[PDB]
Structure 1
């Protein structure tokens, strides 16, 4: 739904994520789990990590963040043509992990906050708008697949 110009801002900012994917992943998950503690309960792997120092010390959580941001980066680089990338993600998050669509909204907010905190200069108003639109499109298409799956 984005313009080419907006996609360029999305991908330009994502290149900075890729310069420290693991660090971005940790910051995003710490923000998600501290702001929305109920999400922490859906991560059986991590629900025992109840302090910020405890999540930061978890190499398992650090590895998961890379997995997550690697999949998200692959989706964003498709500039909306991400049917095949979203299919297995919707399938697992709807029917295996049982993640409400609202939690993807919480994670999207956390991504935006971390990008702004690490890259306040490059993640200005226009890049923030483009990245919000890209994540909104991701959530819309995931929600449509949830419905196809019966969830």
Structure 2
């Protein structure tokens, strides 16, 4: 649950992402894959990537980064009223991709890391607080659907 002022911070930060969605999406996935190499094994189309240089050179990884952040941005713009947008993603990630909630924690922290890396000194403590709360809400509502499905 976020206040109006917190949502305003989230959507202000998101403007930074929308200026370069592919570059942000690429770096988020690279941070996930290099920090948590077990996550790469869930992607049949990226498991061939052995080095970060190959990851950086992969145009399909940048494409998928655009898909991921476009979906997340659509959810964030609903300011919590995201049941219709979130349900299909919860279902596909639990039942088809088999993504444990832990990996959603990993990618949430990766987003925070990338924002500081690309905007050092321009991602203030209030903005980090609000973005963190928004990603916690996203993860918590996914977790509720995971529990319904019995997925661990």
Structure 1 residue runs of 4 or more that deviate by more than 3 Å after TM superposition: none
**CA offset at residue 50 of structure 1?**
1.9
The CA distance in 1 between the partners of 2:43 and 2:77, in whole Å, is: 27
* Residue number in structure 2 paired with 1:144: 144
Matched, 1:117 2:117: yes
1:123 CA drift (Å):
1.1
Could you tell me how far apart the structure 2 residues matched to 1:138 and 1:76 are?
8
Secondary structure, counterpart of 1:48 in structure 2: coil
| Cα deviation 1:90-138 (Å, max 9, x = unaligned) | 0100000000000000000110000111122331100001000000000
The 1-side partners of 2:79 and 2:122 are apart by 20
Post-superposition Cα deviations, 1:55-88, rounded to whole Å, max 9, x if no partner, equal: 1111111100000000000000111110001010
Partner of 2:17: 17
Aligned positions, number? 151
CA distance in 1, matches of 2:150, 2:105: 20
Give TM-score, length-normalised by structure 1.
0.98
Note the residue ranges of structure 1 that are not aligned, 5 or more in a row.
Answer: none
Gaps of 5+ in 2: none
Do the aligned residues in 2 keep the contact of 1:13 with 1:122 (CA within 8 Å)? Answer: no
Given that residues 14 and 73 in structure 1 are in contact (C-alpha distance below 8 angstroms), is that contact kept between their aligned partners in structure 2? yes
> RMSD in angstroms over aligned alpha carbons?
0.8
